[PDB]
Amino acid sequence: GDRSYVTVNNPKDNLRMVTVADYTFIVNRTRQVRENQNRTNGGTFRDNVDAIINVRGGQYGRKLEVNINGVWVSHQLPPGDNAKEDPPKVDAQAIAEAIATLLRTAHPTWTFNVGTGFIHCIAPADTTIDILETKDGYADQLINPVTHYVQSFSKLPLNAPDGYMVKIVGDTSKTADQYYVKYDKSQKVWKETVGWNISVGLEYHTMPWTLVRAADGNFDLGYHEWKDRRAGDDDTNPQPSFVNSTITDVFFFRNRLGFISGENIVMSRTSKYFEFYPPSVANYTDDDPLDVAVSHNRVSVLKYAVSFAEELLLWSDEAQFVLSANGVLSAKTAQLDLTTQFDVSDRARPYGIGRNIYYASPRSSFTSIMRYYAVQDVSSVKNAEDMTAHVPNYIPNGVYSINGSGTENFACVLTKGAPSKVFIYKFLYMDENIRQQSWSHWDFG
Length: 445
Fold this sequence. Notes:
By secondary structure, the protein is mainly β. Helices cover 5% and strands 33% of the residues. The strands form nine sheets. It has a four-stranded antiparallel beta sheet, covered by helices on one side. Strands 10-11-12-13 form a four-stranded mixed beta sheet, with no helix packed on it. Strands 16-17-18-19 form a four-stranded antiparallel beta sheet, with no helix packed on it. It is elongated.
């Protein structure tokens, strides 16, 4: 595979790997994910270049006229007097070509096309359709102009030329809405579609990578594929908060996938990994990607996500925090309340053997292995007490690996200050009380 993503000066602290039986993730904490330069319509979509007017049939004695840039064009429907010749000119298609030929004479430079009950207008190369009106002469059901915006969904033109982008501002009935649609020629329906001048998805390579067996017996390294945005524009389908930043320590909390990036927790859709955009912006559902920062006034940067007890804790330096929701995990139900303010070293990932989690906190020239646990007090209260109180000057200040065996009932600590020595911590718990605290080190050469 490509080694560009994994190439870094300090692998221990700049690279993080999280593996699960289904997926593996490789995280480079020094790389920001940014955006791809491609836009939905290439960034070359202008709403005032082309517009359509739809015809629905006219009654007797109606003078209907349409203007584009001044230069009004008037067409008079016959009064209900003639017998043979009046009903044929009532026909909606007859009016459409009647206006089309009239508009071609008024605007020889442009191209006018008639479809099923509509007339499609094109500016030649570099002109706008500003100041457009249409005098129906009736309650406006005969002809009305829509360029690219409609009041509600039911006010959409019944037909449109192939893919026509229309923005529904909404009638202020239920919510903001402000979604987009694109007509389909093959299937006579309107379908929701992404904006016109916005970016699509993510870079796909700055994102965390992976490696799989590929059934050959040899692993291959590559990146993931993340579903592109398909709901709406910005401010309604906003870009995730980690796009212009670096992400660390991918984690799983619910059926969705979580990312940590600069005191910001970003989650995907439930049961839908790699989808960090809402599927629809017209209606917001509970299982949509959410972004919750922090509930702490002091500065803090989350670095680790450890699942302790029936709750998920997003540890940082000098703060611990906890993630929970009263009911369904929505964008409004996420809590991120603080729990404690114990200093933690980011070099060594916290490790859990039993009811306890063991982590390292360097003092000034030696580290003190601490134990995180839930005390007998009621409700959510947590504490950390030093396991090296009697041996402060024993571990030479640089710790990167903390591990242990649940069955053998001990923990082994690796350090950079003493590369040769392996510090082991033998402990025993009976009746919820500690029975021994054996600190010693092993030497191999």
